[PDB]
Design an enzyme around this catalytic site. Sequence first.
Site, PDB file in Angstrom:
ATOM      1  N   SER A 166      -3.208  -7.388   3.235  1.00  0.00           N
ATOM      2  CA  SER A 166      -3.581  -7.275   4.646  1.00  0.00           C
ATOM      3  C   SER A 166      -4.034  -8.624   5.197  1.00  0.00           C
ATOM      4  CB  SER A 166      -4.674  -6.225   4.816  1.00  0.00           C
ATOM      5  OG  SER A 166      -4.220  -4.959   4.359  1.00  0.00           O
ATOM      6  N   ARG A 182      -1.452  -6.369  -7.096  1.00  0.00           N
ATOM      7  CA  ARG A 182      -0.502  -7.311  -6.520  1.00  0.00           C
ATOM      8  C   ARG A 182      -0.873  -8.734  -6.929  1.00  0.00           C
ATOM      9  NH1 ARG A 182      -3.814 -10.323  -3.009  1.00  0.00           N
ATOM     10  NH2 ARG A 182      -5.291  -8.954  -1.887  1.00  0.00           N
ATOM     11  N   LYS A 210     -18.574  -5.044  11.063  1.00  0.00           N
ATOM     12  CA  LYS A 210     -17.757  -4.955  12.277  1.00  0.00           C
ATOM     13  C   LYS A 210     -16.802  -6.135  12.477  1.00  0.00           C
ATOM     14  CE  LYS A 210     -21.556  -7.309  13.480  1.00  0.00           C
ATOM     15  NZ  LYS A 210     -23.042  -7.237  13.569  1.00  0.00           N
ATOM     16  N   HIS A 261       0.828  -1.208   0.000  1.00  0.00           N
ATOM     17  CA  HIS A 261       0.000   0.000   0.000  1.00  0.00           C
ATOM     18  C   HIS A 261       0.861   1.257   0.000  1.00  0.00           C
ATOM     19  CE1 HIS A 261      -3.155  -2.697   2.135  1.00  0.00           C
ATOM     20  NE2 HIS A 261      -3.401  -2.664   0.835  1.00  0.00           N
TER      21      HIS A 261
END
Lengths: 157, 157, 157, 157, 157, 157
Positions: free
Chosen positions: D127, D90, D41, D17
């Site tokens: 991530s 990526r 959430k 990133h």
Amino acid sequence: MTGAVCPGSFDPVTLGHVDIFERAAAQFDEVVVAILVNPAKTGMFDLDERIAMVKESTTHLPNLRVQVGHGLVVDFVRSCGMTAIVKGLRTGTDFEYELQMAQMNKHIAGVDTFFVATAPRYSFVSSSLAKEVAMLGGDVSELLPEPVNRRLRDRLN
Amino acid sequence: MTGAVCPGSFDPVTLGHVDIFERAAAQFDEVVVAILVNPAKTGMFDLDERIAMVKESTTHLPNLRVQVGHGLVVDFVRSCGMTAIVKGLRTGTDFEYELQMAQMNKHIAGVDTFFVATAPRYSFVSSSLAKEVAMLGGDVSELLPEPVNRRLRDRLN
Amino acid sequence: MTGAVCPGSFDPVTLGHVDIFERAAAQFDEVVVAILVNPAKTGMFDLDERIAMVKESTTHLPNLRVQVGHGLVVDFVRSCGMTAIVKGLRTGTDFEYELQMAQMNKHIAGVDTFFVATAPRYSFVSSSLAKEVAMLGGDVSELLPEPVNRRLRDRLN
Amino acid sequence: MTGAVCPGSFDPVTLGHVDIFERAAAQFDEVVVAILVNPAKTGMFDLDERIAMVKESTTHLPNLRVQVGHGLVVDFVRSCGMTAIVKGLRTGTDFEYELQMAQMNKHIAGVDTFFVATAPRYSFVSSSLAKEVAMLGGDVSELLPEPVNRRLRDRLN
Amino acid sequence: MTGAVCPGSFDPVTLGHVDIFERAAAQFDEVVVAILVNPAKTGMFDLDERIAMVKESTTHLPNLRVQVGHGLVVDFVRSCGMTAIVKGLRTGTDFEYELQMAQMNKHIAGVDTFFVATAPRYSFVSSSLAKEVAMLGGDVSELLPEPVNRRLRDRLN
Amino acid sequence: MTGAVCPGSFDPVTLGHVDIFERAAAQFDEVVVAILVNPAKTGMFDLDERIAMVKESTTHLPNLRVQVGHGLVVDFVRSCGMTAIVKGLRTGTDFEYELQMAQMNKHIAGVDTFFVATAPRYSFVSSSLAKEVAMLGGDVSELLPEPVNRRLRDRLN
């Protein structure tokens, strides 16, 4: 009433091609196999031989006919009174290019292209690879119709 | 005589879907749109609404009918007396998974799958993305049939 | 202050190219269209004609200029005082090769490459396919700028 | 004058990133990193932590700012007074889905999306994979900024 | 001396998997099949059953052993005293994700991953699709080992 | 006992190739690098030079040997007493064609092909691109072994 064209150079026709011919013939009233003329005169088999090989390999499909194609595929299709092209997908097909041509063909002539995956057992044969392997001594006879194997053997002998 | 099935969840039908319905209807004697039941009850529109939206969006195709599908697509296809499935390709289609299913479907039932690229202008709409964009306030009305836009507006209001 | 280079052979420029030029021009202070010289002398239109066609097709973009490129794209870019290349993506783009070149270009000169998808309506035109279709009698005039259509008509006549 | 938005969930930001942030910052007058709120959430790091990690990892880029995004990315972009999104590529990027969204985003708001390949050394971190590997004891510290490594170590301890 | 690990959930093992096991066993001194524990407890067959099915399906491979895997695959591999993973490719494999993991695995543990294409006849079976088809009444018995077919029949009865 | 062949034209060998040689050498008892003869006599470096460059670049791999290949790769492999080919994947590899050949090679000779991703830092070099960049003045010395850089410098001088 319904009709599809299966275009290609068929130098030579393979069992992957025949698989697609069979599926087209089962789903459309008429199928025309359009053999395209080799541009800069660079094929292995001449036009008469390619026609004979396709004919001899499709005697079990009475709603299929073989014709020599000239010019834009879409012009040929519309001259056949059809508006559909059927093309096989195999391992190594340039699908993005096939998609580009399909969209162009739709744009210029309103002709639809239907893609259908070839049977797994015939999914890795292509005319080019079959010829290259045969010329170097490899046995591709299980991947080609017997009318082709006969002619391939003769030329290599 | 010839027939194709166009299966999907159609929650809701988009103009990409309608494009494919039109091409199937032009190339096959009969087309059946098979609306598959939502498994774990998680869609936006209920079955009756999805049926109505497809019907209302295809009144110009007299050889097309809409039916609720149950079980394996291939079982539905063969119950329709057909052996062909027609599926659209768009940007974001999981083509490798579609190919896997096509080969499996051929293996278990002898049913062929024909893929056809959706028109470029409708190539980026999907039911999911259309819903997500609409729920967040975006205007997707040019990508959906008016019977869908009417219902989408009502639900969002 | 900011600047991008749009390199290509543009033989001839298409509306897909012009779409990308427009997006680059909207996002960078300056855009240079770099027309690369044809190596083994094999194009349809000569350099002067390609330049004229791009110029005539971009009069509405005052921050864009047209230049002949020589040598490595990255050398040209850095000679323009820039460090960005903008390249369009269409159906049939060899993206993996574009990615390889982008990574090489970054490695050797620190130049970034930004890819942007061409508008769907222009996503299936390429210079090569446009020429091939036109030479065989097909109408691609909706996919090319009028300055190109004028010249294409003249050459075909 | 020129401006790009780099949207994502950044849970947590990786050096992949940061590579993209750096390239955007070098090519546009202003860059806004838009951190999207986690829907149901379900993230690892809360919003305040994600903001802090991006800020702490980009102190060397004075034309970059960090903001929380809400709603459609394109609405955020146009509220920033910009019309460009910059997204990294990526290994493992769902590029077809990114392309679908890009075309949709263009359609609904006229916003362009520019894709740029991340540096090879950072091309396999994401991530999700970074978190999964770290949770199972693997060392991903070379693939994440030190402000992230500090927080990741704390949570795992 | 040489050794490869073949990791997966094998719920259940298919003939595609067995094909890969056979090729690994022919090319490496030792092969370990690593059955990974199902995370959120969501599989069809429990661990003991998956082990039994793999064992019963590989009695013809004396250099192959079956073990339950825990944690990072690379940790398991290095605990086996090996540094190679062998993974099959089939239609529908998420190859880009496999590549991402391979590069990550190399990065964190120095472990190499070798990919090998499954035989065409077994190239469209996956555990998930096999289960889904079987649950809906379809015959996938030609795509699975008999020890699996026996258990699948029992559960469905 | 175990053995793999790494075939290619190696005109010239790159560090991407050497990376793959190293991984093959670590996982197989013996590795043979098979340098294929250039067909229509069109390479940059002649056969003796290509052999020397590979030899000089692999002195740290005592279980690796270099041989000139002739005819079908599979014939060479089986003449080496092996049944495995190891091929690298990089950005720009025609993987679909590699897969087609792998399936053909398996079909005609029972030889397995194992693919392994090259290290990210060497993932964008290819012999062709390296030569093209070098001929136009670009520095690719970090992507090639020093024995190649020495010869490349000499030819360019």
